[PDB]
Amino acid sequence: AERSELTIHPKEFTTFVRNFNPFLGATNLHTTTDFIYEPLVVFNEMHGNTPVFRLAENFQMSDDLMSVTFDIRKGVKWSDGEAFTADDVVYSFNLVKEKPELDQSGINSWVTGVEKVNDYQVKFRLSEANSNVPYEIAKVPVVPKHVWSKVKDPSTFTNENPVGSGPFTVIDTFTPQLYIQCENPNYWDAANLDVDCLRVPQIANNDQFLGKVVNGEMDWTSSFVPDIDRTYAAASPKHHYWYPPAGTQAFVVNFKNPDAAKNEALTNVDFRRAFSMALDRQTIIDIAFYGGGTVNDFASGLGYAFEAWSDEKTHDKFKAYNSYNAEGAKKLLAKAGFKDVNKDGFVDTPSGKSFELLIQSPNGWTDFNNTVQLAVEQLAEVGIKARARTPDFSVYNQAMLEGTYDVAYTNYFHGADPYTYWNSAYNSALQSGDGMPRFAMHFYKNEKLDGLLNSFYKTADKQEQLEIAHGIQQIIAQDQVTIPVLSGAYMYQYNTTRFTGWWNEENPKGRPNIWAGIPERLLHVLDLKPVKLEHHH
Ligand SMILES: CC(=O)N[C@@H]1[C@@H](O)[C@H](O[C@@H]2O[C@H](CO)[C@@H](O)[C@H](O)[C@H]2NC(C)=O)[C@@H](CO)O[C@H]1O
Ligand SMILES: [Ca+2]
Ligand SMILES: [Ca+2]
Ligand SMILES: [Cl-]
Ligand SMILES: [Cl-]
Ligand SMILES: [Mg+2]
Ligand SMILES: [Mg+2]
Ligand SMILES: [Mg+2]
Ligand SMILES: [Mg+2]
């Protein structure tokens, strides 16, 4: 054809709503960040957080780690031809400070203010010392001031005709079931780009996905695929995948459940430990994930990928509570006083109340749904009554934000050090705010823990940072805050029918996934090249 179209699948939808607002992660399309709004810097997390400079050409932190200046690349244009400058960066950060519902990461608690030094330099002032703040700053979308300052309420703005900095800003085709996002005519890095457009089909769940990917209809995906060698790999020599290791997955319990009986159970550490011992984590990996994961028996959730960081003494002390031990679970329930007093085989609370835990995972995330159903069965074998629900992701998510759920199975962000998981999963500041994600919504709060998290990057002292990690590990482990299950994978499938250049095990340039929130996907698409099709008629 006359243009190359790359078929991608970042996110499940039942119908596409035209929304390219990069601040509205709960309602926008998942090709907005990176592809329409390019970041200042992409940190290559798989390669030691190596900064890859994009719209900024440099940054420099102060010696006291209380401020940082970014240098903006000259000669970059917005897709409408106007210049990308410091003005746009300063506006974007002031916008998020003024409208904190647009803060999806917690940036506002780190950056007290921004200043334009000149047309191509921005200075950020910090609330506390933080050597990790350039990483945090890179998370914030930069939008064109000359457009957005004329918008009446950016927090409700759907941005249907976007002006962007990234490689793909033109909305070529848009229907409820398909849209096509084509090349920015003024793209600053055009000589590096060999893909003409992104083609985005509507896919609601893993079952619908399976049929399409096995039939060779996709190019770049990151979905769960069951029995992948037999179903997908075997269908074509052009069907490939690479699954580098990812983050923790866990059952999260609501410490503020409004039901008296359920609250009584979930806030009890003996109960959380018994729940944890009932689980057969390797069987969950084997059945629900077809072997694609590693047991996580760290009460702190750290997982085995951070051996240099782990306090082995703490891990070993609480490991027994995070290992399969059904008899141990029954004994602990008995010692704690969860006794069955109405002859149905299921333990009741110390106050004598019956209860059944409702465990949720998102609709269509079938690997997680199957994990929950296995756990329900395993819990029954120690006398804990539970049953599964698979609500739509938005309903699942909202139940966690509002604290109406009982237990949720979830994955987490994964980074180059343990802070990505521990901060996002446990910092109580992330339990409030209309832009917050689900990850900290157990509503367990510990002042000492927050203090340690907020000091993680405060000293430039490697040994002290390690001791802070050991402190965090001890607190979370001894309180068994969540029930960690496994460490998962960055699922990624690619097709060599129409494109080459893919990252893979022999070319492991970075995280290969197509999800929003993987900024490396920008770097990945800049490596892809179309293949000339085999002739036919
Ligand atoms: C940390 C986090 O929330 N990551 C999300 C991804 O898990 C999610 O991808 C979905 O993951 C499910 C669980 O393994 C899979 O069943 C499902 O196939 C997969 N969906 C897609 C479209 O890849 C993505 C997309 O919802 O969002 C990430 O934020
Ligand atoms: Ca290139
Ligand atoms: Ca009972
Ligand atoms: Cl401003
Ligand atoms: Cl631990
Ligand atoms: Mg203003
Ligand atoms: Mg301007
Ligand atoms: Mg080009
Ligand atoms: Mg010390």
Numbering used by the authors: -1 to 535
What's written in the study?
VhCBP is a periplasmic chitooligosaccharide-binding protein mainly responsible for translocation of the chitooligosaccharide (GlcNAc)2 across the double membranes of marine bacteria. The chitooligosaccharide-specific SBP is localized to the periplasmic compartment of the bacterial cell wall and serves as a mobile component of the (GlcNAc)2-specific ABC transporter. VcCBP and VhCBP belong to cluster C/subcluster IV (C-IV), members of which are specific for oligosaccharides, including mannooligosaccharides, cellooligosaccharides, and chitooligosaccharides.
(GlcNAc)4 partially occupied the closed sugar-binding groove, with two reducing-end GlcNAc units extending beyond the sugar-binding groove and barely characterized by weak electron density. This suggests that the mobility of the fourth sugar has a knock-on effect to weaken the binding of the third sugar. Docking simulation of the structure of VhCBP in complex with (GlcNAc)4 revealed that interactions are formed mostly with the two GlcNAc units at the affinity sites 1 and 2, whereas on sites 3 and 4, only two hydrogen bonds are formed, by the main-chain carbonyl of Ala514 and the Oδ side chain of Gln102, respectively. The disadvantage derived from the twist of the glycosidic linkage appears to predominate over the advantages derived from additional interactions/disorder of the GlcNAc residues at sites 3 and 4, resulting in the lower affinity for (GlcNAc)4. The binding affinity did not correspond to the degree of polymerization and was the lowest in the longest ligand, (GlcNAc)4.
